Design a protein around this ligand. Structure first.
Ligand SMILES: CNc1cc(Nc2c(F)c(F)cc(F)c2F)nn2c(C(=O)NC[C@@](C)(O)CO)cnc12
Ligand SMILES: [Mg+2]
Ligand SMILES: [Zn+2]
Length: 326
């Protein structure tokens, strides 16, 4: 029989299919295991263990290992952010306009990619790693340094004791899953945002419905890449109580990087100077130039499924706009 804390956790997890899940409460209730508990719930919900013959002990060992490689000392890019992107992707995959569009393998790829997408994040940007001549930037030739590392770690961790969750997949399933996971995580690099959005806009213009109709791999992967990119950029679309916590965390992470740049005599990166900050102006700018253009295009692709998400985004933007000190 479940512990009283485990029962409160099970009750919170009943909202796993809802936008606005109490992810921070789940992080506290699970004893800092939001990624493990949320992924296990989603895998059970979607019958992924049965479909891909994943031993339950193998899944739990891998999830705990993966979660252990997210840094507890990093304010934003940690296991809570990973659990949040996983759960947001899970909700986006269930959108009516995408019903019966994706295979179980494509679903597994989007969820697995979301889980590993920021693993072993040091809390600093690609540029900081490049400017310091870090061994990571040297290994990855200054190109999507972090994103390449997140993927290499996510896959390397499958080799630890009883961690190979893909042990019963055929070589064909593994190569297809691997290619999709790579295409998705590499699309999370912000340097790819503008080209990803431009291609999503092109698809919206020439949109074919049967519920969406996606004929080729190129179209299917573009939707999956944009979906996980939307989940990664979903904080401003969440209820304000959740969004504000995400903002405090990213600002704390940015300010810690600025402190590191300052003590090293480096130029302080945009939004990283705690002495010359505009938290509210930075959120309006992020929403106006990145989040709103992306979510507006997604809302067009899945019309009218994302209407409430777009309405919350617009309400959160006006809350921050009204907060700017004059
Ligand atoms: C909750 N608020 C935020 C999350 C948030 N998440 C976020 C991030 F911090 C990254 F480093 C990379 C990403 F892919 C992100 F989705 N970014 N953000 C900004 C912002 O300008 N970010 C874009 C930038 C300056 O990383 C492009 O290189 C401002 N507020 C936020
Ligand atoms: Mg990332
Ligand atoms: Zn992320």
């Amino acid at each position: 029989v479940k512990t009283e804390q485990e029962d409160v956790l099970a009750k919170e997890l009943e909202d796993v299919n809802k936008w606005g899940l109490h992810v921070f409460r789940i992080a506290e209730l699970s004893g800092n295991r939001p990624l493990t508990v949320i992924m296990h719930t989603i895998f059970q919900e979607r019958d992924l263990l049965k479909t891909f013959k994943i031993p339950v002990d193998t899944l739990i060992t891998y999830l705990m290992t993966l979660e252990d490689h997210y840094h507890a000392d990093v304010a934003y890019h940690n296991n809570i952010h990973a659990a949040d992107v996983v759960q947001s992707t899970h909700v986006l995959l269930s959108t009516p306009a995408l019903e019966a569009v994706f295979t179980d393998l494509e679903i597994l790829a989007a969820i697995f990619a979301s889980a590993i997408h920021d693993v072993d994040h040091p809390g600093v940007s690609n540029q900081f790693l490049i400017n310091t001549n870090s061994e990571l930037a040297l290994m990855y030739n200054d190109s999507s340094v972090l994103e390449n590392h997140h993927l290499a770690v996510g896959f390397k961790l499958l080799q630890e004791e009883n961690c190979d969750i893909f042990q019963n997949l055929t070589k064909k399933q593994r190569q297809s899953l691997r290619k999709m996971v790579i295409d998705i995580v590499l699309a999370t690099d912000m340097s790819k945002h503008m080209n990803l959005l431009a291609d999503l806009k092109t698809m919206v213009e020439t949109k074919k419905v049967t519920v969406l109709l996606l004929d080729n791999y190129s179209d299917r992967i573009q939707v999956l890449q944009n979906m996980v990119h939307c989940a990664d950029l979903s904080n401003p679309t969440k209820p304000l109580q959740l969004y504000r916590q995400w903002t405090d965390r990213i600002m704390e992470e940015f300010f810690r990087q600025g402190d590191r740049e300052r003590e090293r005599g480096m130029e302080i990166s945009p939004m990283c100077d705690k002495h010359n900050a505009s938290v509210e102006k930075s959120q309006v700018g992020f929403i106006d130039y990145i989040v709103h253009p992306l979510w507006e295009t997604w809302a067009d692709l899945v019309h009218p499924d994302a209407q409430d998400i777009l309405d919350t985004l617009e309400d959160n933007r006006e809350w921050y706009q009204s907060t700017i000190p004059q």
